[PDB]
Design a protein around this ligand. Sequence first.
Ligand SMILES: C=CC1=C(C)[C@@H](Cc2[nH]c(/C=C3N=C(/C=C4\NC(=O)[C@H](C)[C@H]4CC)C(C)=C\3CCC(=O)O)c(CCC(=O)O)c2C)NC1=O
Ligand SMILES: C=CC1=C(C)[C@@H](Cc2[nH]c(/C=C3N=C(/C=C4\NC(=O)[C@H](C)[C@H]4CC)C(C)=C\3CCC(=O)O)c(CCC(=O)O)c2C)NC1=O
Ligand SMILES: C=CC1=C(C)[C@@H](Cc2[nH]c(/C=C3N=C(/C=C4\NC(=O)[C@H](C)[C@H]4CC)C(C)=C\3CCC(=O)O)c(CCC(=O)O)c2C)NC1=O
Ligand SMILES: C=CC1=C(C)[C@@H](Cc2[nH]c(/C=C3N=C(/C=C4\NC(=O)[C@H](C)[C@H]4CC)C(C)=C\3CCC(=O)O)c(CCC(=O)O)c2C)NC1=O
Ligand SMILES: C=CC1=C(C)[C@@H](Cc2[nH]c(/C=C3N=C(/C=C4\NC(=O)[C@H](C)[C@H]4CC)C(C)=C\3CCC(=O)O)c(CCC(=O)O)c2C)NC1=O
Ligand SMILES: C=CC1=C(C)[C@@H](Cc2[nH]c(/C=C3N=C(/C=C4\NC(=O)[C@H](C)[C@H]4CC)C(C)=C\3CCC(=O)O)c(CCC(=O)O)c2C)NC1=O
Ligand SMILES: C=CC1=C(C)[C@@H](Cc2[nH]c(/C=C3N=C(/C=C4\NC(=O)[C@H](C)[C@H]4CC)C(C)=C\3CCC(=O)O)c(CCC(=O)O)c2C)NC1=O
Ligand SMILES: C=CC1=C(C)[C@@H](Cc2[nH]c(/C=C3N=C(/C=C4\NC(=O)[C@H](C)[C@H]4CC)C(C)=C\3CCC(=O)O)c(CCC(=O)O)c2C)NC1=O
Ligand SMILES: C=CC1=C(C)[C@@H](Cc2[nH]c(/C=C3N=C(/C=C4\NC(=O)[C@H](C)[C@H]4CC)C(C)=C\3CCC(=O)O)c(CCC(=O)O)c2C)NC1=O
Ligand SMILES: C=CC1=C(C)[C@@H](Cc2[nH]c(/C=C3N=C(/C=C4\NC(=O)[C@H](C)[C@H]4CC)C(C)=C\3CCC(=O)O)c(CCC(=O)O)c2C)NC1=O
Ligand SMILES: C=CC1=C(C)[C@@H](Cc2[nH]c(/C=C3N=C(/C=C4\NC(=O)[C@H](C)[C@H]4CC)C(C)=C\3CCC(=O)O)c(CCC(=O)O)c2C)NC1=O
Ligand SMILES: C=CC1=C(C)[C@@H](Cc2[nH]c(/C=C3N=C(/C=C4\NC(=O)[C@H](C)[C@H]4CC)C(C)=C\3CCC(=O)O)c(CCC(=O)O)c2C)NC1=O
Ligand SMILES: C=CC1=C(C)[C@@H](Cc2[nH]c(/C=C3N=C(/C=C4\NC(=O)[C@H](C)[C@H]4CC)C(C)=C\3CCC(=O)O)c(CCC(=O)O)c2C)NC1=O
Ligand SMILES: CCC1=C(C)[C@@H](CC2=N/C(=C\c3[nH]c(C[C@@H]4NC(=O)C(C)=C4CC)c(C)c3CCC(=O)O)C(CCC(=O)O)=C2C)NC1=O
Lengths: 177, 177, 146, 89, 72, 164, 164, 164, 164, 72
Amino acid sequence: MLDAFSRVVVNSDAKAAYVGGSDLQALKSFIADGNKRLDAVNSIVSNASCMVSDAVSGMICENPGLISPGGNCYTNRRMAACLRDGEIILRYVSYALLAGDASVLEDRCLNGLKETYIALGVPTNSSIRAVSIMKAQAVAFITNTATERKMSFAAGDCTSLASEVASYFDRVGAAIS
Amino acid sequence: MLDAFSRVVVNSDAKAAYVGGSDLQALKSFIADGNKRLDAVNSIVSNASCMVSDAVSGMICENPGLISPGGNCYTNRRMAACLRDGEIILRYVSYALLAGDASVLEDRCLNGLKETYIALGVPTNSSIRAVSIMKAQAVAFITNTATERKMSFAAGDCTSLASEVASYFDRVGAAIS
Amino acid sequence: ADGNKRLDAVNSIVSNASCMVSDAVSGMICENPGLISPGGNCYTNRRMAACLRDGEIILRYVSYALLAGDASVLEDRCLNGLKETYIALGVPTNSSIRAVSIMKAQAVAFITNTATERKMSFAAGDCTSLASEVASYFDRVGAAIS
Amino acid sequence: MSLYASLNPVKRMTYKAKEQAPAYVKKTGNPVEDFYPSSWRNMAPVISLSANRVAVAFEKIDAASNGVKANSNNKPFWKSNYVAPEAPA
Amino acid sequence: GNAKGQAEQARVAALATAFRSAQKSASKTTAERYSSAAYGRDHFAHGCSYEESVFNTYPATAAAMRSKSYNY
Amino acid sequence: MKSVITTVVSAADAAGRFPSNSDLESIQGNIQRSAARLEAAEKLAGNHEAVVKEAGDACFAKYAYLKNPGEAGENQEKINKCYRDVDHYMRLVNYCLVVGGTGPLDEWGIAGAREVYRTLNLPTSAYVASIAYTRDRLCVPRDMSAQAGVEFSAYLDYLINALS
Amino acid sequence: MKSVITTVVSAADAAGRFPSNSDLESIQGNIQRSAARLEAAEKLAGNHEAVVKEAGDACFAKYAYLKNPGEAGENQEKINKCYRDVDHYMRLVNYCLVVGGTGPLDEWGIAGAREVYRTLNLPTSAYVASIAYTRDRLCVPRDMSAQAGVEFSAYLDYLINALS
Amino acid sequence: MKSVITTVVSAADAAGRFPSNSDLESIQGNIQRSAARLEAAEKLAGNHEAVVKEAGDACFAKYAYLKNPGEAGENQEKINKCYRDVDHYMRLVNYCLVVGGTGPLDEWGIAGAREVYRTLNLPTSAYVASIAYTRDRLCVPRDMSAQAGVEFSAYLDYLINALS
Amino acid sequence: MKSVITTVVSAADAAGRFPSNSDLESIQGNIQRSAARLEAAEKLAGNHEAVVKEAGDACFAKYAYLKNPGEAGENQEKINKCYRDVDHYMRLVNYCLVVGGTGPLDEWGIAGAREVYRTLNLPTSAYVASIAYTRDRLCVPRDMSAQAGVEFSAYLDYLINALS
Amino acid sequence: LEKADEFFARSVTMQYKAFACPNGVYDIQCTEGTVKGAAYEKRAMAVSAAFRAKQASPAAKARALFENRRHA
Ligand SMILES: C=CC1=C(C)[C@@H](Cc2[nH]c(/C=C3N=C(/C=C4\NC(=O)[C@H](C)[C@H]4CC)C(C)=C\3CCC(=O)O)c(CCC(=O)O)c2C)NC1=O
Ligand SMILES: C=CC1=C(C)[C@@H](Cc2[nH]c(/C=C3N=C(/C=C4\NC(=O)[C@H](C)[C@H]4CC)C(C)=C\3CCC(=O)O)c(CCC(=O)O)c2C)NC1=O
Ligand SMILES: C=CC1=C(C)[C@@H](Cc2[nH]c(/C=C3N=C(/C=C4\NC(=O)[C@H](C)[C@H]4CC)C(C)=C\3CCC(=O)O)c(CCC(=O)O)c2C)NC1=O
Ligand SMILES: C=CC1=C(C)[C@@H](Cc2[nH]c(/C=C3N=C(/C=C4\NC(=O)[C@H](C)[C@H]4CC)C(C)=C\3CCC(=O)O)c(CCC(=O)O)c2C)NC1=O
Ligand SMILES: C=CC1=C(C)[C@@H](Cc2[nH]c(/C=C3N=C(/C=C4\NC(=O)[C@H](C)[C@H]4CC)C(C)=C\3CCC(=O)O)c(CCC(=O)O)c2C)NC1=O
Ligand SMILES: C=CC1=C(C)[C@@H](Cc2[nH]c(/C=C3N=C(/C=C4\NC(=O)[C@H](C)[C@H]4CC)C(C)=C\3CCC(=O)O)c(CCC(=O)O)c2C)NC1=O
Ligand SMILES: C=CC1=C(C)[C@@H](Cc2[nH]c(/C=C3N=C(/C=C4\NC(=O)[C@H](C)[C@H]4CC)C(C)=C\3CCC(=O)O)c(CCC(=O)O)c2C)NC1=O
Ligand SMILES: C=CC1=C(C)[C@@H](Cc2[nH]c(/C=C3N=C(/C=C4\NC(=O)[C@H](C)[C@H]4CC)C(C)=C\3CCC(=O)O)c(CCC(=O)O)c2C)NC1=O
Ligand SMILES: C=CC1=C(C)[C@@H](Cc2[nH]c(/C=C3N=C(/C=C4\NC(=O)[C@H](C)[C@H]4CC)C(C)=C\3CCC(=O)O)c(CCC(=O)O)c2C)NC1=O
Ligand SMILES: C=CC1=C(C)[C@@H](Cc2[nH]c(/C=C3N=C(/C=C4\NC(=O)[C@H](C)[C@H]4CC)C(C)=C\3CCC(=O)O)c(CCC(=O)O)c2C)NC1=O
Ligand SMILES: C=CC1=C(C)[C@@H](Cc2[nH]c(/C=C3N=C(/C=C4\NC(=O)[C@H](C)[C@H]4CC)C(C)=C\3CCC(=O)O)c(CCC(=O)O)c2C)NC1=O
Ligand SMILES: C=CC1=C(C)[C@@H](Cc2[nH]c(/C=C3N=C(/C=C4\NC(=O)[C@H](C)[C@H]4CC)C(C)=C\3CCC(=O)O)c(CCC(=O)O)c2C)NC1=O
Ligand SMILES: C=CC1=C(C)[C@@H](Cc2[nH]c(/C=C3N=C(/C=C4\NC(=O)[C@H](C)[C@H]4CC)C(C)=C\3CCC(=O)O)c(CCC(=O)O)c2C)NC1=O
Ligand SMILES: CCC1=C(C)[C@@H](CC2=N/C(=C\c3[nH]c(C[C@@H]4NC(=O)C(C)=C4CC)c(C)c3CCC(=O)O)C(CCC(=O)O)=C2C)NC1=O
């Protein structure tokens, strides 16, 4: 796909310009907090399994019509398909958060997800409710703001990574809206 | 057509939640520098006419193949169409910068621009070169960093608006890439 | 002798050098706008970039001369016949002297940490000897052209 | 060691170095090539100051307005007509 | 229309727009009468000398006629 | 989603023109009213379970025939849906106070409401009674500021003029 | 006659709706800018014989070929018509400062100007030179207030963007 | 691509009719004029480096201010683009001489030219001076035949009427 | 676009698994490398005018037969294209130094190069001579650091192993 | 080739609707509603007439293609 380093290469390639020391500082600042990015990605991979199940259960307990007969998450097969649908989204958001660039779920996950769901009859409201719940869980894990689980980090600020991962979840719902 | 105010309404409507005082501070901070946003938009509308012509002339002087016989900007009709093509993009970016939300050019400008250009045979490299030039001009006007033109502002910082308008230009090139 | 005052004085200049240069040339335009008028020799695109480059080169050399504590390299490299080259190209020398004095004011503002747009964190003491030294160094380049 | 000796002020007086006469190069009358030849032109020293490190390096200085550089007047050859009649008075 | 109240709301809308069409300015209507007569001849009466004389003297017959199989 | 910004950008887009000085001039009025229109919205947000409570039973105190058999409010879940129907309108009033225009009301509350309330046989006079009760006992020094009360009341009778 | 009021009333008329809160909210911005936009208009009114005096000969100092035989400014009444053509534009700038929008400019100065200046063979670059000279030596503490100057300058380069 | 054939087939197609006798009658006029219109075209083809050479500097001899700083013809590549801009027009004149109508001119040279020359700030009077110089020293017996000269000159002032 | 990140995410995606500890462990090596690989890149960026100049004529000093008639470098624009062909490769070396892997080289410089240089009849030995000349007079304390020269030279002979 | 057709439609519609808004004001020509609530009914007429036109016969649709191409 494209990480944060190849993005400036494809940006300066249309210029036919060498990557100089002016625009390199945005890349050395990317190196200066690489440990914070790894510390952030680890805290999401650590409890992705609770994150998915809590998100689908919250989406169901908010909208009890999905488990009605003829609902989209009615049978065991459809519920397993929903828990499978959410985990792939979380996996691709973790890929994009690690890479520092959103271009890995631009083409491998969201390219064609819009009309797949409406060929299947998947309701688009509950899909964005679930990933909004997953976004609220992810920001509560990048910072130590989760309620019953606290992970030990070195002291400092991680709000830039939280805004980045929120911006990675906004386009998932926008791709399927 | 949605501004920064209706975005949080459509965000909290899926919640069926009242807009409370926690998330209202992001809206009162939007009011607190509305004068900076108007001061920023005025500085782009003031010299949009030089901005478009300089961008298309720089794109042509970088790539002299476009004015070749059979190039896409060869005749007078195609050159007038190119100067018309760039001005609409600048107009919609100004709309999105004034509204505080990008949702006015995803549906009125960029929705279908991708395949219009490849049905027409418009080369996609030069279009992103031109608005990359327009982005570099716009950031040089939000701050007083332009070469021969200086506009009088009240003192302060406008880097947030410059990052916002850069983020409004990256999705234009991403929509047609 | 002491470097911890000297190296601080150089670091207070070489950090914010580009803003000093871009403010100096814009102030030089701000007094007389004939140079950006069609017919002035900062009017074209390739001239004002050269003027920026010359202002930065002058700042480069005076910042090196403040570090070295002498002006011999300053008059060997830069001022070795600059004035007649500006004459032979055709350069309004009064405006470049004005821009040099603007940079001289900005440098002694930054050295004393009395800049009223930005604040450095320093130790406690008096750097006015270095301020007078860099004022003399700016007077060298102000007098070498005329 | 040359940089260290250039920055030491007390060795500057106790060890007064000798002048070196420059190499013979022909003068051409025009001062732009006499005083600022292409072998030197637009070189200027970077000073970088970090923790226990002082570094100086001479680099070629360029700036730019809207899209083209300052030293683009002297672009290399691999990157590289009618005559207008004279207007009457 | 296709609802029970939709067919009469078309009547009250169409009777309002015909009155609002009479509120145009003089430049707005004379140029319109010339362009309708221009529209009638190149689209309907190509070599017909009779209907072009009809159009030049009565532009609303040129205009209200449609060149398309709109099936209206 | 009609508002101050939404109007001027659609006007400049229909004219095909850049934002002019009159376009930027209208947003200054939004800036000047934000400091009186947002306090009414937050006061409604912090207090809406009591204001919804006194309006719905004021609807039934005026029209006690609604609890008759064969009516719109016979049994308990109809009354629970009535309190929900009132809370939906107060939420949209909060949304129009936040936006600045009447966009959320005529987008989600007004458009198509007459077709719904006719075929589902609900009286609109019982809707406007609860809204008029809320408007009439808004008490402007205590409940809000002096200026927030007129901004809050101006959206309330927009509903009353729209439903009647 | 595009202005703040003129925009919101035709928006409400095209929607067929009453004036809402966003309509009244935009007029407050007109009220807040009236105290900086009218100072520029009367300063131009009280000083306009000197301002177009220095603009018209700045037009001819840049393009001295206009006084050649066969040109647009050969003899004296062409130059007198040129000063009149400049004074007409400065009067429309005063009118747009009084109205609030750019209505008087695109109603009487801009619309159809390209057809006139082409067939009557007048260069528009000589028009924009006099307007740019006026914009560039507006000096904001002395000539106006700090805020009246950008209101005055924003209408000037509207002409330059319209004519070029 | 307006020509003799293209007009009559579009007329017969808009009428939905077969080619009539008047359609075939118009092509006989094309046959009778090809023996005077084609000699002008190849005379221009065989001589076009000298014809554009004397027109471009006649443009600059009339308007010597174009080589001033800040103008359209300041440095050398602008003048080289000016000779190219003139050669493009003479090639289109050759194309219209070959086709028979003015199709290549208003398809590729005229349409949109006023928008280009205004925003790129080029004077059209300097374009028409070089074309008028070419038209005025076309010399009727030597350079062409007697009939090829008016066919060549009739397309030249079509450009002058289109650009002015 | 092969790099450190691009490899491990493609491996985790083909396995269908989350990023493990070995995935995060490989990025620490990128962090530790970045402080020696980026100074070689901008040292090349700040100096590429002279580095390409001495390589292209070192290509022609070794093979002086290329300027013969019928060869690849006969006249002047072939030599100008040769300097451009060399500058393209040095730009890709700068790009691979910035990325971390050899992605920009085998994406845009290596893939398909043997088909191009064979049918366009260019000798690859003259390409590798200029790259070997650049590699052999890289001088490790002055031109770079001790470790940056290690990294700069490792990408250079990747080209030599790919072209030969 | 499909959605490029709908962008080409939306563009010429957008360019033609600028004639009905001369320089910032909506003129007498648009006037979608004349009372409160009429615009939503005018919406519901058009969005159903668009559906009714697409369930036409193939011969009508094939006639409508070629007659649009003949008149354009
Ligand atoms: C290698 C890089 C390098 C530097 C950038 C300097 C930075 C520096 N300066 C001082 C220390 C100092 N720096 C200053 C200088 C100033 N104080 C003022 O009030 C003036 C505004 C300003 C003069 C321009 C003074 C007065 C001292 C204390 C005396 C001294 O140690 O020189 C010290 C020792 C104590 C401290 O941390 O402050 C250091 C590390 N020294 C270095 O070795
Ligand atoms: C080693 C030391 C060293 C310097 C000090 C400069 C000095 C210098 N400047 C210029 C060249 C120039 N210098 C200027 C600069 C200015 N003209 C003005 O009107 C302003 C007063 C001022 C900028 C603030 C301009 C505009 C040119 C280009 C002149 C031209 O148009 O040819 C030249 C000719 C070669 C060139 O273009 O680079 C030289 C040697 N260059 C050096 O190599
Ligand atoms: C249009 C006309 C126009 C001008 C006349 C100048 C205005 C101007 N400002 C300064 C003055 C200055 N200029 C700077 C330079 C900077 N300040 C910073 O914080 C940055 C790091 C850096 C680039 C912005 C500083 C530090 C001062 C002194 C301010 C102070 O005392 O703190 C000076 C030099 C001394 C003086 O005369 O006051 C001038 C000429 N700019 C213009 O646009
Ligand atoms: C080879 C052809 C060629 C050109 C025609 C110019 C055109 C040009 N100008 C700028 C860059 C710019 N262009 C402008 C525009 C303007 N400045 C003003 O004062 C006016 C109001 C307005 C019209 C002239 C601004 C403000 C910048 C940024 C600052 C600057 O470089 O001046 C850029 C951006 C560079 C980039 O990032 O890609 C280009 C290509 N440069 C070229 O290389
Ligand atoms: C209706 C028309 C209309 C406008 C054109 C603007 C005009 C405008 N700008 C500012 C005011 C301002 N504008 C800026 C903006 C900047 N300053 C800079 O140095 C940067 C170059 C630039 C960033 C984009 C800043 C920093 C202020 C000061 C107040 C603030 O920070 O909010 C103010 C408030 C204070 C004042 O009276 O000046 C006004 C009215 N507002 C309007 O209502
Ligand atoms: C987003 C905005 C929004 C609204 C404004 C409401 C509007 C609304 N209310 C009802 C539905 C209803 N609304 C009421 C309310 C009342 N009946 C009365 O006798 C009194 C007038 C009033 C209580 C005070 C009742 C009783 C129903 C149920 C009617 C029925 O299904 O029989 C319905 C039909 C769907 C349903 O049954 O829920 C809708 C769309 N719903 C919305 O989603
Ligand atoms: C956000 C929206 C919002 C409102 C509109 C008000 C509405 C409101 N008013 C009252 C409560 C009251 N309202 C009034 C009425 C008035 N009081 C006076 O002193 C005047 C005589 C008159 C204003 C003209 C009185 C007297 C009470 C006390 C209990 C009662 O008599 O009803 C209550 C019950 C809770 C309480 O006691 O505060 C509520 C919800 N409150 C809100 O939160
Ligand atoms: C209400 C708004 C309004 C305007 C803006 C002007 C616009 C305007 N100017 C002229 C007409 C003119 N305008 C000019 C002006 C100039 N020619 C030049 O060479 C310079 C560019 C400039 C002087 C600086 C001249 C010389 C004429 C006369 C042209 C002619 O008739 O030959 C005409 C034709 C009618 C006439 O001859 O008066 C019109 C409509 N008139 C208006 O009523
Ligand atoms: C209503 C519109 C209106 C304007 C835009 C100005 C325009 C204007 N300026 C000047 C006159 C002047 N204008 C300036 C320019 C400036 N003055 C300074 O102190 C700064 C350096 C610079 C502002 C940046 C100067 C120095 C003069 C005096 C005479 C001159 O030098 O031109 C004059 C001649 C009459 C006079 O001296 O006042 C006029 C008409 N006056 C107006 O009535
Ligand atoms: C197929 C038909 C066809 C044409 C007719 C021309 C028309 C034309 N000319 C130019 C472009 C130009 N045309 C000129 C010509 C002139 N400027 C003057 O001062 C004189 C009036 C004249 C020389 C005698 C110049 C100088 C430019 C470059 C303008 C610029 O980019 O600054 C451009 C912009 C693209 C470009 O820069 O090349 C176009 C479309 N080109 C075409 O492809
Ligand atoms: C295909 C298009 C085409 C043209 C329009 C002409 C245009 C033309 N005329 C002349 C050249 C000339 N043109 C004339 C003019 C005339 N000669 C006379 O005998 C009369 C007095 C007058 C015709 C009325 C003269 C006298 C010369 C000779 C050199 C000169 O005086 O300019 C030249 C220079 C080459 C030459 O000498 O032939 C050219 C290109 N030639 C062409 O190839
Ligand atoms: C992005 C990466 C990239 C590259 C690596 C080059 C690769 C490359 N070079 C050439 C093309 C060429 N490359 C050379 C270069 C040389 N010939 C020699 O004799 C020497 C070996 C060497 C000079 C030292 C020459 C002379 C041509 C032109 C060959 C021809 O067209 O006859 C071509 C054909 C297209 C063209 O003509 O430009 C391509 C794709 N181009 C690229 O875009
Ligand atoms: C970014 C990539 C980059 C490089 C690889 C080098 C490559 C390089 N070397 C030299 C220049 C030189 N290179 C050397 C070679 C050496 N010097 C020594 O002291 C050793 C004996 C030997 C290292 C083993 C010498 C002696 C010169 C001086 C001129 C010469 O003899 O060629 C030059 C000419 C400019 C200059 O003099 O610096 C260049 C471009 N420079 C670069 O900018
Ligand atoms: C496809 C079936 C269909 C329609 C037709 C419209 C009909 C319509 N127009 C409206 C509302 C409306 N209509 C217009 C006029 C119109 N708009 C323009 O952009 C230009 C140039 C116009 C003249 C033709 C304006 C100016 C408004 C006000 C809102 C706005 O600013 O656009 C409203 C909202 C009414 C309200 O909220 O009060 C509707 C329903 N909607 C539909 O679903």
